[PDB]
Design a protein around this ligand. Structure first.
Ligand SMILES: O=C(NCCCCCCNC(=O)NS(=O)(=O)c1cccc(Cl)c1)NS(=O)(=O)c1cccc(Cl)c1
Ligand SMILES: O=C(NCCCCCCNC(=O)NS(=O)(=O)c1cccc(Cl)c1)NS(=O)(=O)c1cccc(Cl)c1
Lengths: 317, 318, 317, 319
């Protein structure tokens, strides 16, 4: 049977005998993603260039507005907003959403792949909503994922039931379930990080990357890929296996990527897909944040690859 | 004034007082590229998954082949997808030779990586009956070349004698909009792009040059690295931001990995028209004389200062 | 606040504290309509004409398949199928759907507006489902409406809460609520019927048409519009007011339009918008059908206009 | 072999060995029409309704056609339904063609999603004088090309030139007009008649009698069916495909009809005649009226020749 995102979420909600509030949220997000995809593909650009006589801000506006108007959210954290957004009372629901509306867009001039990342939490306390309701560890995630605006548009949705991949059919604006309950390879053959900053690498990073290019044994060296857009790199890691690194070093002891709307949703997708995601010192999903915009180093991907990195990492402890 | 692909090519053609034959070819290519873009974005995929109860690389080849054949402007067609050159049937024969990779990078499209179309256009040089040899011309002879990038958006980069022009596809109306005119690459970039996974097979010149980017001898800032692994995306980034792109030979590919006829030459021609460079290490890509339509070439291309810096390291190693 | 079809139906379902089975039906139907619209607009026509080297059947297949896979239906009545389709037990739900997948398509060669018409009944008994479960009067409808594929694509959905009109935004494949709680004008200035059958008209129809061209009260004559596609004519009637007539003639002594999947849903929509729909002798919605494909004469539209027809009809006994 | 509007126009131009200036015109027009179609289909309407936190379609359509034609470098004088005066193209953009167009005919009723369309007529500038309104005051006989885009269940561009009438279907997936009907000809006789019968009390006596013959045929033939969309492009296009007759005739209250000669009547008459049909005012061929005002009206009766002939015979019967 053909299965859409709308039908999938609705069928999971009836299975779980829920009220439908999470389904209203995910439906709203899905609508926002189709609008971002349409703008990312430059629909209407002819009207900008005079046929009849910013993108990350629009994406933020689409996500913020679809989420607020879903009546399912109370606190919204965006990479684009300095403070947490508090949903007005008449629209308040029980969920906290952290999102990067258009991750990687700083390089969209080269039409590089871009994406939207989101993580959904349940509001934990009965207190008035505030920034603190978004300061939960990734362990508490209800749902997380990303939309990849790549050669095609794909939404990856991770929940307790696993990870599911929905392809956007632009002809009809429907997300078609094309990969059910996806699992990452136990071990990959690709590593992904920016080697241009090699001189600032932690010694453990230097050694682990050196083993990937010059394996001690007779196995094939890994291939290298680094798109520079986290959603693109993580998705390839999910599909092909391997390891993605943005680790800590002395000049950036906390990594560079952000915990709430980059690392945690990707770590959560990875763990639901049978992968791993660590900072080097602990699982990403176990970091308890103190700032909505705090940074986290992240090493994620195939479990065997991530375990091997941690082995090199403790060696240098 | 708004400018489209269809308007731009027609206006260059009237300037040159041509017959319109190259415009008919380029229109056909443009139409095929919009069909490929539409398919690459998975329009109609719901019907594939049973909403009512051909691999993409094969479809893309078919779109280019058929639009080019029926354009009446071509006589010989070389595609990455076909072992032998395609000879256009007599009644449809025109004067141009086209080498193209219909869906470059498609082997990894499962991860939705950017993919692209690359093309190079030659005038058939000899009066012999059309054959594979008509496509064995050095890149210096190119009439026009470029690529379509199916990335976050779909962009056609078209290079001719008049320079490099970038057209953005407006999906809402199926029109290519001129968005960057007479494009020029930076004299020097800050990004280097290659698969460092083959570091154990790198020739000493490549090894030293990469060492200079991460550990600059002059205590300037190291370059950033990017590598999509899809040639059109990496070359286009190099064009837009500057820098250097390397795909040198390795043990698995002693004559390089990339193809001369429908990957290296068109990108080399786009780069040289954009004030960039493209070398194999020993000579300009555009100066290689091909002997086999599918032959491979090592390629280093991008900002002139960076490529010259590589060549100086290359000369240091004899 | 922006509102979609999916958001609207879901929030009405939560208001009613229903199981969600009707929402899955409408979601399925909405997906079918976007697919028909894209096909009606000739998306992909280039591939038919050889770029790389029946429409009424497709529409039926899309509706049949989306309704079956919603798990909400048990009996399906279509203009394209002689007998009712009985949903197989594993996909069986509680709703009975009568639909015209592509009304007006016999003249689609001239690109006339076409549409999809649907009526939704709840199955009443615990007997095994059969054709007779579709033999209910229009009074029993739970929901009804139509999709109009005209200059743009619009879904008009009628339920107990009223009529709501959603415009399809093709850029994102979303139905946007653009007209809430629609009500038809008390009286219009347009009458709509095939005057080519004037030689076969009942005397009351003959007199009523004379009144539109030669008004007894010295008011301005009505204009005439007749697209020949029922969804196009009825929707104009809804938007501008007036009256639409398909009365009996010699080739169609019981009228031509079908009661179950043309007359009843339009009659239900009109009554929910404050209009009327009659056969001349009784309300359309009160006819008890004995055949899934049986015909009905139908006069519908603005109440004052239809009441004026009933006045002329009553004059002729 | 698949054929698009872009290939078809380029192939006819090379045959005719033209400079390509008309091809640039038609290409610009085609681009304007795809933008109109996209807007008419309500692409982006979600942004009007607040999805992220604005001219009528007839104003935008006029803006699209004007700008694409101006910037084609192929036009000098432009006549639009939306402008009282003709537009004189600035010198640096000036070409040799005069275009009369209705940017979105039928749009006053677009609230009900009725079919709408764009109609155009293209002339060569005749005189060596500085371009002015006078250059659009040519009879329909002088048309180089004419046609319409129908935004109906699908979008179709009907392009008529000396070589005949060709129908191109718009494929939205790729924004290409695909040639689907070559060198189309209308039926010799149809079975549909098309006019607003609500104004019957104002009908000319010939119109009353001819419509009476369609509903009550004297010779025991079948009565005609009636269709009236109220949007001219839809009614004419149905007339072209199915045959029959379309009437917007003169009456006592409107001695010149209601439709406009320059950008509505002439192009439909030109399409009809290239398709082997007819179009008359009752008194002469539409294409033979010599206009004196760019916005002047003309009565039009068009469609299958036999149906039009039967109309003219009844019209002549009434002196
Ligand atoms: O629609 C109806 N009711 C609203 C839907 C109720 C819940 C159904 C599904 N549950 C759910 O989604 N739960 S959850 O928490 O979001 C969740 C939980 C876990 C994972 C996920 Cl992914 C989501 N009723 S009705 O009869 O159809 C009706 C009645 C009148 C008018 C209409 Cl128009 C329709
Ligand atoms: O169309 C017409 N003629 C055909 C077009 C002539 C070519 C004009 C432009 N030349 C050109 O593009 N040359 S080139 O070699 O391809 C070249 C050269 C250099 C760079 C590039 Cl990019 C391309 N005539 S017409 O009056 O419009 C006409 C007449 C009858 C019916 C119609 Cl429908 C239209």
């Amino acid at each position: 049977d053909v299965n859409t995102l709308t039908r999938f979420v609705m069928e999971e909600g009836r299975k779980a005998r829920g009220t439908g509030e999470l389904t209203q949220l995910l439906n709203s997000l899905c609508t926002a993603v189709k609008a971002i995809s349409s703008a990312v593909r430059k629909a209407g650009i002819a009207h900008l260039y005079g046929i009849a006589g910013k993108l990350d801000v629009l994406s933020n506006d689409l996500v913020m507005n679809m989420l607020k108007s879903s009546f399912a959210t109370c606190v919204l954290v965006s990479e684009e907003d300095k403070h947490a957004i508090i949903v007005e009372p008449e629209k308040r629901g029980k969920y906290v959403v952290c999102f990067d509306p258009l991750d990687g867009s700083s390089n969209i001039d080269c039409l590089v792949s871009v994406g939207t990342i989101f993580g959904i939490y349940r509001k934990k306390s009965t207190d008035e909503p505030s920034e603190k309701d978004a300061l939960q560890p990734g362990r508490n995630l209800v749902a997380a994922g990303y939309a990849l605006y790549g050669s095609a548009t794909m939404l990856v949705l991770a929940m307790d039931c696993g990870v599911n991949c929905f392809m956007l059919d632009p002809a009809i604006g429907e997300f078609i379930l094309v990969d059910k309950d996806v699992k990452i390879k136990k071990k990959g053959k690709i590593y992904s990080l920016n080697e241009g900053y090699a001189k600032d690498f932690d010694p453990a990073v230097t050694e682990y990357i050196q083993r990937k290019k010059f394996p001690p044994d007779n196995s094939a060296p890994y291939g290298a890929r680094y798109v520079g857009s986290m959603v693109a790199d993580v998705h390839r890691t999910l599909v092909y296996g391997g390891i993605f690194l943005y680790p800590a070093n002395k000049k950036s002891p906390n990594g560079k990527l952000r915990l709430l709307y980059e690392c945690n949703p990707m770590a959560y997708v990875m763990e639901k897909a049978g992968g791993m995601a660590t900072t080097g010192k602990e699982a990403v999903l176990d970091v308890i944040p103190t700032d909505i915009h705090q940074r986290a180093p992240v090493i994620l991907g195939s479990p065997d690859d991530v375990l091997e990195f941690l082995k090199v990492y403790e060696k240098h402890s």
